[PDB]
Amino acid sequence: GETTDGVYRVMTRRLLGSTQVGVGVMQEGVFHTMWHVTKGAALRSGEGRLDPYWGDVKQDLVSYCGPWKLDAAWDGLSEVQLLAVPPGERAKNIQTLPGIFKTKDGDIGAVALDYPAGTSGSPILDKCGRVIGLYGNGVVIKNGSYVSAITQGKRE
Amino acid sequence: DMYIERAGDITWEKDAEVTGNSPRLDVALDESGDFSLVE
Numbered sequence: 001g002e003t004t005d006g007v008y009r010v011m012t013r014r015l016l017g018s019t020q021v022g023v024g025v026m027q028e029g030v031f032h033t034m035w036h037v038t039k040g041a042a043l044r045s046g047e048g049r050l051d052p053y054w055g056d057v058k059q060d061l062v063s064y065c066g067p068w069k070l071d072a073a074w075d076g077l078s079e080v081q082l083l084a085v086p087p088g089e090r091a092k093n094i095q096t097l098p099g100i101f102k103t104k105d106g107d108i109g110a111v112a113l114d115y116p117a118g119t120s121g122s123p124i125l126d127k128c129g130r131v132i133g134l135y136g137n138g139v140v141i142k143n144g145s146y147v148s149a150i151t152q153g154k155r156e
Numbered sequence: 157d158m159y160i161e162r163a164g165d166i167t168w169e170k171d172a173e174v175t176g177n178s179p180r181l182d183v184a185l186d187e188s189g190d191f192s193l194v195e
């Protein structure tokens with residue numbers, strides 16, 4: 001199948017028509033997405049099969065064909081871009097200054113942008129084009145707005 | 157059966173639309189990977 005680096009839609013034909021369940025990042029021959037998008041199931045790229053390699057429900061991440069490769073981190077100061085790939089719509093860059101999720105285990109950047117659930121797995125980038133995490137694991141706050149963590153994995 | 161389709165290159169775009177606020181929130185992450193607001 002297709003192994004070129006870049007952003008990909010994750011689709012299913014199980015429901016009515018063709019439905020976009022999420023998005024992911026192909027980098028260094030490894031496909032990276034959020035666990036809730038695939039539930040750890042195998043994927044197809046044309047006639048090729050991608051098998052899960054690593055995953056963790058708590059981090060809400062999964063890699064296919066190899067170990068997690070993305071290790072860039074938000075610097076805690078600068079604006080970043082969500083490369084949103086919404087269902088049925090063209091990929092689009094949105095620039096924003098992340099907020100913070102404060103947890104008992106440390107602070108994590110968060111992006112206050114609301115897109116349909118099938119946009120989960122879209123990459124968040126720094127100014128050099130490096131993927132600093134994936135969009136789609138978040139919370140609804142007081143005023144009803146959605147805020148996603150910048151979820152990044154560990155490169156072993 | 158799930159399948160993937162290429163949607164684009166991963167690049168920073170100059171003069172992309174700039175939006176969104178920057179909230180500082182206390183949150184908790186449970187064993188199921190779900191975040192919740194702590195108050």
Ligand SMILES: Cc1cnn2c1CNCC2
Pocket residue numbers: 114115116117118119120135136137146148
């Ligand atoms: C990106 C994502 C994932 N789940 N949800 C969203 C946004 N709208 C609320 C539900």
Ligand SMILES: Cc1cnn2c1CNCC2
Pocket residue numbers: 036060136137138188189190191
């Ligand atoms: C939007 C969605 C669906 N299932 N899960 C999520 C996010 N947290 C991990 C589990």
